[PDB]
Design a protein around this nucleic acid. Structure first.
Lengths: 153, 124, 95, 23, 187, 49, 85, 149
RNA sequence: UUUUU
RNA sequence: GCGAGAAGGGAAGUGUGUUUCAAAG
RNA sequence: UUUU
RNA sequence: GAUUAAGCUGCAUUACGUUUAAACUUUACACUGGAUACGUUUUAAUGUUAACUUACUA
RNA sequence: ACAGUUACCGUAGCUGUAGAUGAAUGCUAAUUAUAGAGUAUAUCUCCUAUGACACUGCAUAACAUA
RNA sequence: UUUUAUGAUCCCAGGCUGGUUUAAUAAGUCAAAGUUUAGCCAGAGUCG
RNA sequence: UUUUUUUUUUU
C-alpha cells in the first residue's frame, strides 16, 4: 500500500520527518512538535501538527501533549526522527525505549549508586515513624532555651 | 509523590523575619484594563496560542497508595463551551474526518500535501 | 542560619544558575474566559456575592419518557450552573 | 482486563468521551 | 599568496584562464572541486600538481639535476621512484606502506581533531605487495606495476620487518594499492 | 506487549558483538530491527480498521 | 512629514484683518522642498533675522490670512529660550 | 503566601546536599601512579597545564566538577573545556581503559544464554510447534520473539 | 537604605 | 566522497496569485 | 523582592 | 619567457543630504550538513543592549 | 456619540470630542537584578578586506589480538 | 479573412495571499465590499 | 487573594 504515501514524499524537499520547532516570546520559548520534510526550514511549512512540548512550566514538571491516533499513523508511512525525539516517545509507551548514551552494558557504577540512594530512602522512613508517637510542635534545646519549630512537607 | 519523600525541617525564630509584612490588608494595585487591544494581542496572545480550540487544564491522574499504579475508574473529561450554550442546530460539514486523505478517480484513498489552516477549528 | 540583611535572603531563595541559551522563565496560563482582559468591579459595589450563571436551554424538544418511572421532562427554562438532581439521572444513564 | 500498556489506557478515555456525546 | 599554476612534465603548453572560476566577481564562498592543495597539512593531486616543470640557469644544469626524484625524502618518495633504483627494478620483492609520518598527522590546520577514541595514551599485520609486471610510462614517477597483494605479519625486531608470512592468497596480481609512501623489503 | 514490555530492554543487552564496532552500536542495531516490526503492526491495524 | 526645516529670507509685520487690531510679527520661511510660506512666531520677543534656519510645524492662524504654519522654539537653530514664562 | 515557597525551597536544598555527598564518596579514583597533573598531561593539553591543576585540589573535585564552575577559571578556552569533560565521562564508565578495538569485544561482551549448544528433545519439538501457532509466521519477522522464548 | 516600638 | 543563491526585488497585466480537480518514472 |  | 592577464547583485569605514535611518556576547537549547555511533561541527539560531509610545507586578 | 454657529422654520457646509498608534519633536524621571511582537528597516560619493587557509570523513586499507 | 464600447491598437507606475482574542439582545456559527507582524508559491543565462 | 496540591470559575 505504498501508493497511499506518494503525495507525502517530496522530491525537492525530501522525505517526511518528525522534529520540533522554536516559537513564542523571547525568554519564554516553547517547543512545538510538527511533521515536515528534511530540507524544510525550522519555522515554516508543516504538514500536520502532532502536539507541543513545554520543558519549563510553573509547576516545575515538564508537560507533553501528543496525539495517540496520529503519531502511530505517521510512523507506518515511514517517517524518521532524531535521537532526542525517540527518547521522549519511548517514555510515553508509543515506541520501544531507546538505549541511553554509551549503551546499557557499560552502566555498571550507576547500578551500585542507585541502590545506595534507594537504601537511604527506606532507612529515612524508619526515622519518622517514632516521631508521630511523640510529635511536639515546639522543641527546645540545652543551649539557650531556644525555640525550634518542626514542620513536614 | 510529595507524601513519599518526607522530611523533617527545623525552622528557628530568626528564619521567619522576612515572612512578616508591614501592611495589614492587600489588594490589586494595578487595574487589568487593557490599553491597546491590537498591540497586546500580537505580542503576548498570538505567540502563546498554538491551538485553534479553547482547552482548559485536564484533571490530575489518580494512582493507588500501596501499589502506586493508575486506577481504571477516574474522573471524566471537562469539555468547555462558549457562553454556556452547547447546542448547534445547523452543524456544517467539516473536512477533519479524513486528515490528509482524499478520494481518487479509482475510488482509492490518497494523501495530500498542503499547509493546514491555522483557524480550521475556530471557524465552525 | 539567620536572615539579618537583604543580601543573605537573596542568596538563599534564588534558583540555581542555569545556561544562558536554554529557557529559564515558565509559560503563563491563559484561561478560556479571559485571553487579554481581566474584568473586575470599579465602583462602590466592590465586595458582593457574584454567583456564576451557566444558561442551559432545552436539550431536545421531543417528548422524552420517564426513566425507570422517574420523570425527566423539563419543567422550567431557567436553569442555574449547578446541575439539578432530575437532570443528573438522564446524563448518568446516557454514558 | 488490567490494561498495563500505556496505549490501551489512552484509548479507554477516548471511547468514554465519545459515548457521552453520542445520542 | 597562492603559488602560481604550473604544468607538469610531459604535458604540452596550455592557455591560462583569466579567472579561477566562473563566479569570480559575483560569488566568493563557492569553491571549485579541482582546487589546489598547497596549504600545510595536505597532499598533492598525484598527477595534477606533484611534479611541476623544473627550470634553472645554464650554470646550474648538470647530471645531478636530473636525479632529484631518486633523492627525495622518505616522507615524499613514492613507489615508482623507489623501485627504479632497486635491483631488477625491484622485481621479486616485497613492499608495504607505513602510515606513521603523514603530513596531516603531525602538521596542519586540522591537526587536533577529536577521534572516536580520544587521545593515544600509549606485532601488527600489514599488507605486502609483490610486483610481478613492471611498465614505465613517464620515468621515474610513473608506471603500471602489476603485483600480487597479500597479508603479512610483522616481527618483534626494532625495525619494521616481515617474518614467515605472507601466508594467505588474497587476490590475483592486480594494480598497486597506494601511491603515497612505501618502504623497503627483505627480498 | 513484548516490544513495549520489560523484555525488550533486556533483549538488547543480550546480543553478540562484532569486531570493529563499539558497544553502543550493538544495541543500536538491535533496537532498529525492533522498530521495523512495530511499523508493520500499526500499518496492518490501520488498514483493517 | 511631521516637520520640515527651512530658512528665513524675509521678515515683516503683517496687520491682522478687522476687527482685530494690533500688529502680529511674521516671517517668510523657505522650506527645504523649495517652497516659501509665511510662518508665525508665537511668544514674546523676536530673534529671527535674514538667512536664519528655523523649524516649522503645523498650525493655523485666524488673525493672519494665508499663514498655516508655526515655528518651534528650542529645537530650531539660533532661537534662544523665551524671556519670561 | 511566603511560607509556602520558603518551605518548598528549603526542602529542595537538602535533597541536593545529601545527593552530592554520596556521589563524592562513590567517585572512581585514579589508577595507581596517576596524579592531578598526570591526568591533564596525557590528554595533550595546551601550554596552560600547571595553572589548571593548581586550581583543583584532588581528583574528586575534578570528576564532580560541573560546567558553570569550570567557567570561573580564566585559564580555560573553549577547546580545552570541551576536551576535559569528555575524558572524565569516559573513565567513569570504564570506556577508556586501553583504547583498542580488541578490548571492547573481550570486556563488554559475555551474554550467557540458558538454552545454548543443546540438542533437541521430544519436549522441545512440541514447544516449538505451539509457539508457531501463537505468532503469525507469514507476517514480519516471526523469529524475533520465538527466539527469546 | 534601615527594621519586633 | 557528500552538502552549499539558505546575504537574490533585476523581468511580467491579464501576468503573478487564489480556488476546484487530477497524477502506479 | 514584601520569593534573585 | 614555461598558465604569471585579480577586488561584487555582497559586507565594512568615512563623507554629503534628510524631521528620522541600528555594532555589545563564556555568541554551545534546537534545525541542519558530514557520518558506522546523541562519534564531530558550523555567526543565517539563541540570549543581552533600549527615546517603555506593550503584558504582569501591598 | 453629543453640543455650538442672529434671540423663527427645510437644505448645505464647519469647530471640539471616539478608536486604530505601523513617524518626529519638547519638559521631567536611570528610581530592586524576573523588559516584549513585525520587511530587523531608505537614496548617493571616495578608500580598505574578500578569491583558496570555508563544515565533515583516513571507514580516504586505521592506532592492526599470547 | 480577424479583433473592436462586454474597451480592439496603444504610453508611465504598482507581484498575490493567511495570521486564533476582539465588549454592543451591530450578543456572528468564518469579524461581513476593501486595513496587519515570524509564513506558502514563485523570481532567465553566460569562463569560448 | 488556597499550609501540607503541581488540582480549584478563589472574588
Amino acid at each position: 500500500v505504498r501508493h497511499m504515501f506518494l503525495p507525502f514524499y517530496s522530491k525537492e524537499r525530501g522525505p517526511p520527518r518528525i522534529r520540533m520547532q522554536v516559537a513564542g516570546v523571547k525568554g519564554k520559548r516553547f517547543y512545538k512538535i510538527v511533521a515536515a520534510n528534511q530540507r524544510d526550514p525550522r519555522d515554516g511549512k508543516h504538514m500536520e501538527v502532532l502536539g507541543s512540548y513545554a520543558p519549563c512550566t510553573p509547576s516545575g514538571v515538564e508537560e507533553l501533549r501528543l496525539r495517540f491516533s496520529r503519531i502511530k499513523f505517521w510512523l507506518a508511512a515511514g517517517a524518521a526522527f532524531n535521537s532526542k525525539m525517540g527518547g521522549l516517545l519511548g517514555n510515553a509507551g508509543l515506541v520501544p525505549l531507546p538505549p541511553p548514551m554509551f549503551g546499557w552494558r557499560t552502566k555498571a557504577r550507576y547500578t551500585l549508586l542507585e541502590s545506595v540512594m534507594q537504601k537511604q530512602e527506606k532507612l529515612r522512613e524508619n526515622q519518622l515513624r517514632e516521631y508521630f508517637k511523640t510529635a511536639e510542635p515546639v522543641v527546645y534545646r540545652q543551649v539557650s532555651e531556644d525555640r525550634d519549630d518542626v514542620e513536614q512537607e | 509523590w510529595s507524601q513519599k519523600q518526607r522530611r523533617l525541617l527545623d525552622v528557628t525564630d530568626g528564619m521567619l523575619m522576612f515572612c512578616r509584612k508591614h501592611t495589614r490588608l492587600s489588594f490589586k494595585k494595578h487595574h487589568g484594563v487593557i490599553r491597546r487591544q491590537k498591540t497586546h494581542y500580537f505580542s503576548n496572545v498570538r505567540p502563546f496560542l498554538w491551538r485553534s480550540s479553547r482547552v482548559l487544564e485536564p484533571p490530575p491522574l489518580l494512582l493507588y497508595r500501596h501499589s502506586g499504579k493508575p486506577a481504571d475508574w477516574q474522573l471524566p473529561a471537562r469539555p468547555f463551551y462558549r457562553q454556556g450554550v452547547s447546542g448547534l442546530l445547523f452543524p456544517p460539514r467539516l473536512r477533519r474526518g479524513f486528515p490528509s486523505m482524499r478520494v481518487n478517480s479509482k475510488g482509492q484513498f490518497v494523501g495530500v500535501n498542503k499547509m493546514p489552516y491555522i483557524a480550521e477549528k475556530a471557524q465552525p | 542560619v539567620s536572615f539579618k540583611n537583604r543580601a543573605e535572603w537573596r542568596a538563599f531563595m534564588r534558583l540555581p544558575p542555569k545556561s544562558r541559551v536554554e529557557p529559564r522563565r515558565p509559560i503563563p496560563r491563559i484561561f478560556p474566559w479571559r485571553m487579554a482582559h481581566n474584568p473586575l468591579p470599579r465602583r462602590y459595589p466592590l465586595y458582593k456575592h457574584r454567583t456564576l450563571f451557566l444558561p442551559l436551554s432545552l436539550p431536545s424538544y421531543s417528548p422524552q419518557p420517564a426513566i425507570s418511572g422517574v420523570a425527566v421532562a423539563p419543567l422550567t427554562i431557567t436553569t442555574n450552573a449547578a446541575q439539578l438532581p432530575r437532570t443528573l439521572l438522564l446524563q448518568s444513564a446516557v454514558r | 482486563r488490567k490494561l498495563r500498556l500505556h496505549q490501551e489506557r489512552a484509548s479507554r478515555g477516548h471511547i468514554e468521551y465519545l459515548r457521552q456525546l453520542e445520542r | 599568496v597562492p603559488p602560481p599554476l604550473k604544468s607538469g612534465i610531459g604535458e604540452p603548453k596550455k592557455t591560462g584562464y583569466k579567472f579561477p572560476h566562473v563566479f569570480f566577481p559575483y560569488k566568493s564562498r563557492y569553491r571549485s572541486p579541482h582546487r589546489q592543495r598547497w596549504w600545510p597539512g595536505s597532499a598533492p593531486r598525484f598527477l595534477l600538481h606533484s611534479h611541476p616543470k623544473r627550470w634553472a640557469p645554464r650554470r646550474d644544469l648538470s647530471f645531478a639535476f636530473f636525479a632529484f626524484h631518486g633523492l627525495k625524502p622518505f616522507a615524499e618518495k613514492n613507489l615508482y621512484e623507489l623501485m627504479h633504483s632497486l635491483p631488477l627494478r625491484g622485481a621479486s620483492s616485497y613492499f608495504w606502506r607505513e602510515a606513521d609520518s603523514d603530513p596531516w598527522k603531525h602538521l596542519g590546520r586540522k591537526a587536533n581533531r577529536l577521534q572516536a577514541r580520544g587521545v593515544r595514551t600509549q606485532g601488527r599485520k600489514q599488507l605486502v605487495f609483490s610486483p610481478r609486471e613492471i611498465y614505465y610510462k613517464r620515468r621515474p614517477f610513473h608506471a603500471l606495476v602489476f603485483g600480487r597483494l597479500s597479508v603479512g605479519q610483522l616481527g618483534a625486531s626494532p625495525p619494521e620487518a616481515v617474518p614467515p608470512e605472507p601466508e594467505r592468497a588474497e587476490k590475483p596480481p592486480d594494480c598497486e594499492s597506494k601511491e603515497q609512501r612505501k618502504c623497503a623489503g627483505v627480498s | 506487549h513484548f516490544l513495549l514490555g520489560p523484555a525488550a530492554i533486556e533483549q538488547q543487552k543480550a546480543a553478540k558483538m562484532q569486531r570493529g564496532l563499539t558497544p553502543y552500536q550493538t544495541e543500536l542495531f538491535m533496537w532498529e530491527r525492533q522498530m521495523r516490526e512495530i511499523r508493520k503492526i500499526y500499518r496492518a491495524q490501520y488498514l483493517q480498521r | 512629514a511631521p516637520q520640515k526645516k527651512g530658512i528665513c529670507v524675509k521678515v515683516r509685520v503683517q496687520t491682522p484683518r478687522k476687527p482685530n487690531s494690533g500688529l502680529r510679527k511674521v516671517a517668510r520661511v523657505r522650506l527645504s522642498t523649495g517652497r516659501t510660506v509665511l510662518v508665525y512666531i508665537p511668544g514674546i520677543g523676536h530673534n529671527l533675522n535674514v538667512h536664519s534656519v528655523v523649524l516649522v510645524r503645523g498650525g493655523r492662524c485666524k488673525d493672519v490670512p494665508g499663514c498655516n504654519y508655526k515655528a518651534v522654539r528650542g529645537v530650531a537653530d539660533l532661537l534662544p529660550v523665551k524671556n519670561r514664562e | 503566601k511566603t511560607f509556602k515557597r520558603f518551605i518548598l525551597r528549603y526542602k529542595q536544598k537538602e535533597e541536593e546536599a545529601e545527593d552530592l555527598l554520596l556521589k563524592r564518596t562513590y567517585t572512581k579514583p585514579l589508577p595507581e601512579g596517576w596524579t592531578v597533573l598526570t591526568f591533564l598531561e596525557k590528554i595533550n593539553i595546551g601550554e596552560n597545564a600547571e595553572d589548571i591543576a593548581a586550581a583543583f585540589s584532588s581528583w574528586t573535585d575534578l570528576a564532580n566538577a560541573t560546567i558553570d564552575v569550570l567557567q570561573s577559571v580564566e585559564g580555560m578556552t573553549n577547546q580545552q573545556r570541551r576536551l576535559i569533560v569528555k575524558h572524565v565521562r569516559l573513565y567513569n564508565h570504564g570506556l577508556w581503559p586501553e583504547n583498542s578495538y580488541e578490548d571492547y569485544i573481550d570486556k563488554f561482551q559475555a551474554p550467557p544464554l540458558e538454552n545454548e549448544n543443546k540438542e533437541w528433545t521430544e519436549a522441545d519439538d512440541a514447544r516449538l510447534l505451539e509457539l508457531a501457532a501463537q505468532y503469525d509466521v507469514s507476517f514480519g519477522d516471526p523469529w524475533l520473539y520465538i527466539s527469546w522464548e
